[PDB]
């Protein structure tokens, strides 16, 4: 059973995302604040994605489902499956 997979987003991966974000120096508290932010972000897209899946009486979340979900949030994504 899947539990605590939020820790699967390693300090290293969060450090790399910040470099792209152009961040030079990071505080120790940042990593946990970020898991939180990423957690909420995902709970929101997947809820919607899954809501779309259910309405089509399917059992598989398709990329379209994620794509429609993102559009509903003003985070339109190009190029997907």
């Amino acid at each position: 059973v899947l539990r605590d997979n939020i820790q699967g987003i390693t300090k290293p991966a969060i450090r790399r995302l910040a470099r792209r974000g152009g961040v030079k120096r990071i505080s120790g508290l940042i990593y946990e604040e970020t898991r939180g932010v990423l957690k909420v972000f995902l709970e929101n897209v997947i809820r919607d994605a899954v809501t779309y899946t259910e309405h089509a009486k399917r059992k598989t979340v398709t990329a379209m489902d994620v794509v429609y979900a993102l559009k509903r949030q003003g985070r339109t994504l190009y190029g997907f499956g």
């Binding site: 899947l2 539990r3 987003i9 792209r20 974000g21 961040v23 030079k24 709970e43 809820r47 994504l77």
Partner: protein, 98 residues
């Protein structure tokens, strides 16, 4: 022994990562987090691969974005280290609290 002063490798890595475009989060770990959050919302749910990839594309896009704004609040503060309150300010003004 040779040793770069603190922050040199960091600039090195900003330059580095801003040139590439590969996802910076381990795949399998991320997929688990997706499956977890999904199944603690509904069951018997399968995922197209590309579906988990769209979600990673978006998440990283979202986080890198957040980090630039966060990095800006810090410089406004005359700091170079993004702190939690920076993310909070950014997130708020961004319209996710506020």
């Amino acid at each position: 022994p040779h040793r770069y002063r603190p922050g040199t490798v960091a600039l090195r890595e900003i330059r580095r990562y801003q040139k590439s475009t590969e996802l910076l989060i381990r795949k399998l770990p991320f997929q688990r987090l997706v499956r977890e959050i999904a199944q603690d919302f509904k069951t018997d749910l399968r995922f197209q691969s590309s579906a988990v990839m769209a979600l990673q594309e978006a998440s990283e896009a979202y986080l890198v974005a957040l980090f630039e704004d966060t990095n800006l609040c810090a410089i406004h503060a005359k700091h170079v280290t993004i702190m939690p309150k920076d993310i909070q300010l950014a997130r708020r003004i961004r319209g996710e609290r506020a």
